[PDB]
């Protein structure tokens, strides 16, 4: 009848915890206590039950798993929950708030499949790494319009409480996913979207969940942390009118790491893109754009992996067709993309050689004509442009002639920068056909790339994980310093608490303006005319080597530095980092490609928006100094937003497998995520407040008197309720965790 209450329900299955048998409750009921303790004291988060087996007045005596004694000091002693919670679906309600006892919690849930757990206001969301059925249209049903106790933990039942706030206070809403590299981002950011979909649906709808399966063609490859790996971050507004329904999205991209498309890292692979086209094109497409195999073309032939288990290439580029279709790409858009695809595989096994001098030759042109041909200009033109740009030296016009390594470099730099346009593109094409609505509120959705660490972390890293480390901040500031702040102002007689987590000075070595941080000492060093990649790491040693706490200059290299996140530290590799600050590109290439007879080629070299590129002062503005604003807005809109919505995703293992839930990879998480000091806030705190006069408006009888903190100062006494769970600040009534939802489901039944 409903689902919810039926212990027959697929709900019941697949998101409850399984009735425990009489064994187990006669466990329930004995009064043995017990705690979680190390067998191994160096190994601190492996851990074994013992039983306390007496107490002194300051410790307590346990038995191990083998049958010895020992004492630990009652204050330093992680006590064992009653296994009655074991499986408790908000970690509020524990007795004991440890990190055994937490990550015990987990284990419970995880091993029967339940992969979300509240802790207080957030949701902890662990990969399962197997498909759950728990995403169809029947749980999306159940879980339409109820309120966050009624339902079991989901991260429907976290969208459905930002789309309710959205219009119960007509403001926006932001709905952020945190986790490192493989947790599960993506996953849970496309399940907000199904919901929002249909919960608030009326071919838009359609096109909008077709949108991702675009982005992640063209955006997505496999690194070694996972095989679905996004390399570039995205906002996504979900769009409603006034009236509450979807009225359409636009999508905000960033950081695509286009250097992926002439480089991968052994075992890697290029983007899906590149493989679902050679392995699903028809025999027409592979004669017309001259394709082979992927191991015939150097850009997916060197890092030893050219497929994923488990995916058809073959069978992914039809649907990568499909979303195309559906989204509105014309049959020759279509084809004008996939030629830009193979062009930029043919550019790359150009071979330049060395002529009789230094300068570069080609004596195959073989690949050059193959990309002339499918970008649609002039070879001969290409040619010169690649081996011999023209620059002005003062205002002269002088031919340079590159060596085989520059030549080589340029032929990249054109690779990266059609193929970082051609995502822009497909970005703002997907962004006018769901973009026709003036909207009214929206729910953005943040997809960042998470923090990834490799034996060589280059700029690119550094980007990512500075992102990571910045909304790591935001989680801090929201749950920590506003939650006690308006503490504080309503003068309730709180006195704070330092909760250690503290992720802005790692902020400001990297982007700070004044002392200059990492990024404003790159940016200088590209602007100055002798700067080398060693001119630079000597600048940043000098600055910060003994200098700042979150930065180590290794005695093991003379190129890398060491930077101290939040989720580790991470030690940087500075080869190359001026050229990818600057991002050049010869001009005598971009001259060659706007005479392109392909139309969408044209448009990537002359669309402004596309092609164009600002000026701060008498230089381009770099990528560092780009980025670094792009995400200061996006900052902006967060704060400036409603109050977000959190969801922790939490990587069980570092083997992408199932049912392997380790305990070191998820308590370090669990730690810098700032989880348990997260739960400690909502419970030591007054998380639910509210303003007097409309306590009474919602629920000597009550409603609109004079003055309603004389009211519900009687309301709670003549009712039954104890008033330490409760403090009457200025101008609210704060209560203690759970007080307001367990009392007015009474009134819900009164
Ligand atoms: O929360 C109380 C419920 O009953 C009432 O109809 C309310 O107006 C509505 O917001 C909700 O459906
Ligand atoms: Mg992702």
């Known amino acids: 009848e409903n689902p919810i209450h039926d212990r027959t329900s697929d709900y019941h299955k697949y998101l409850k915890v399984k009735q425990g048998d009489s064994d187990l409750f006669k466990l329930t009921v004995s009064d043995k206590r017990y705690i979680w ?3 191994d004291p160096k190994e601190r988060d492996s851990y074994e039950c013992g039983e306390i087996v007496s107490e002194t007045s300051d410790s307590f005596t346990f038995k191990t798993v083998d049958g010895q004694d020992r004492q630990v000091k009652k204050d330093d002693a992680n006590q064992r929950n ?7 679906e908000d970690m509020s309600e524990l007795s004991y708030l440890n990190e055994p006892a937490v990550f015990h919690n987990l284990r419970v849930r995880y091993n029967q499949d339940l992969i979300y757990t ?3 206001l957030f949701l902890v969301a662990v990969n ?3 498909r759950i059925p728990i995403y169809t249209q029947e749980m999306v049903d159940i879980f339409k319009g109820r309120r966050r106790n009624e339902v079991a933990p989901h991260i429907f039942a976290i969208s459905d409480v930002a789309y309710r706030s959205m219009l119960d206070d007509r403001q926006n809403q932001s709905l952020l996913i945190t986790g490192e590299s493989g947790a599960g981002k993506t996953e849970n950011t496309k399940k907000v979207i199904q919901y929002l979909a249909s919960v608030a649906g009326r071919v838009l709808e359609q096109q909008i969940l077709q949108a991702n399966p675009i982005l992640e063609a063209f955006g997505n490859a496999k690194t070694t942390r996972n095989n679905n790996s996004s390399r570039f971050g995205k906002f996504i507004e979900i769009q409603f009118n006034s009236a509450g329904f979807i009225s359409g999205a636009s999508i905000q991209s960033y950081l695509l790491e286009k250097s992926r498309v002439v480089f991968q890292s052994e075992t890697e692979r290029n983007y899906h893109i590149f493989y679902q086209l050679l392995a699903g094109a028809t025999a027409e497409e592979k004669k017309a754009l001259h394709l082979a195999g992927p191991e015939s073309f150097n850009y997916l032939n060197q890092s030893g992996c050219v497929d994923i288990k488990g995916v058809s290439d073959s069978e992914e580029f039809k649907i990568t067709r499909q979303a195309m279709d559906i989204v509105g790409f014309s049959q020759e858009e279509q084809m004008s993309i996939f030629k830009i695809i193979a062009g930029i595989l043919h550019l790359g096994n150009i071979k330049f050689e060395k002529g009789a001098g ?8 073989t690949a050059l004509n193959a990309a002339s041909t499918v970008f649609g200009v002039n070879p001969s033109v290409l040619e010169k442009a690649l081996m011999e740009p023209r620059i002005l030296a003062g205002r002269d016009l002088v031919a340079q002639h590159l060596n085989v390594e520059k030549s080589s470099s340029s032929r990249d730099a054109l690779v990266k920068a059609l193929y970082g346009r051609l995502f822009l593109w497909l970005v703002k094409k997907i962004n006018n056909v ?20 490799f034996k060589v972390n280059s700029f690119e890293q550094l980007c990512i994980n500075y992102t990571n480390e910045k909304l790591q901040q935001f989680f801090n500031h929201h749950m920590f310093k506003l939650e006690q702040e308006e503490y504080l102002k309503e003068k309730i007689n709180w006195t704070f608490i330092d909760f250690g987590l503290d992720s802005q000075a790692t902020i400001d070595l990297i982007d700070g303006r004044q002392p200059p941080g990492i990024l404003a000492l790159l940016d200088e060093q590209s602007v100055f ?4 990649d060693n001119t630079l790491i000597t600048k940043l040693h000098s600055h910060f080597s003994k200098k700042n706490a979150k930065y180590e200059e290794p005695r093991f290299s003379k190129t890398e530095f060491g930077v101290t996140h939040y989720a580790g530290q991470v030690m940087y590799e500075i080869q190359d980092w001026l050229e990818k600050n600057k991002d050049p590109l010869q001009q005598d290439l971009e001259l060659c490609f706007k005479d392109s007879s392909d139309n969408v080629v044209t448009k990537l070299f002359n669309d402004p928006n596309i092609a164009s590129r600002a000026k701060k002062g008498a230089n381009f503005i770099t990528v560092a100094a780009q980025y670094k604003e792009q995400l200061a807005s996006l900052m902006a809109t967060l704060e400036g937003g409603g109050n977000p919505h959190f969801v922790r995703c939490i990587i069980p293992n570092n083997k992408q497998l199932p049912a392997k839930l380790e305990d070191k ?6 730690r810098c995520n700032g989880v348990l000091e997260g739960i400690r806030i909502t419970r030591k705190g007054f998380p639910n407040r509210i303003i007097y006069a409309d306590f009474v408006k919602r629920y000597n009888v009550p409603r609109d008197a004079e003055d309603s903190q004389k009211a519900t100062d009687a309301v709670l006494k003549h009712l039954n309720i104890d008033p330490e769970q409760y403090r009457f600040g200025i101008t609210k009534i704060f209560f203690r965790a759970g007080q307001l939802a367990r009392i007015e489901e009474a009134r819900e039944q009164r």
Not at 82 to 88: A, L, M, W
């Open 82 to 88: 009653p296994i009655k919670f074991d499986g408790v």
């Open 529 to 532: 005319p002798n700067a080398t």
């Open 434 to 453: 769901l973009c026709q609505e003036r909207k009214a509120y929206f729910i953005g959705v943040l997809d960042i790339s998470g923090f990834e660490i």
């Open 665 to 670: 990879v998820v308590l370090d998480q669990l």
């Open 358 to 365: 230094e300068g570069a030759v080609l004596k195959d042109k």
């Open 118 to 120: 509240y802790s207080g």
């Open 128 to 130: 399962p790494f197997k």
């Open 37 to 39: 303790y190390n067998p």
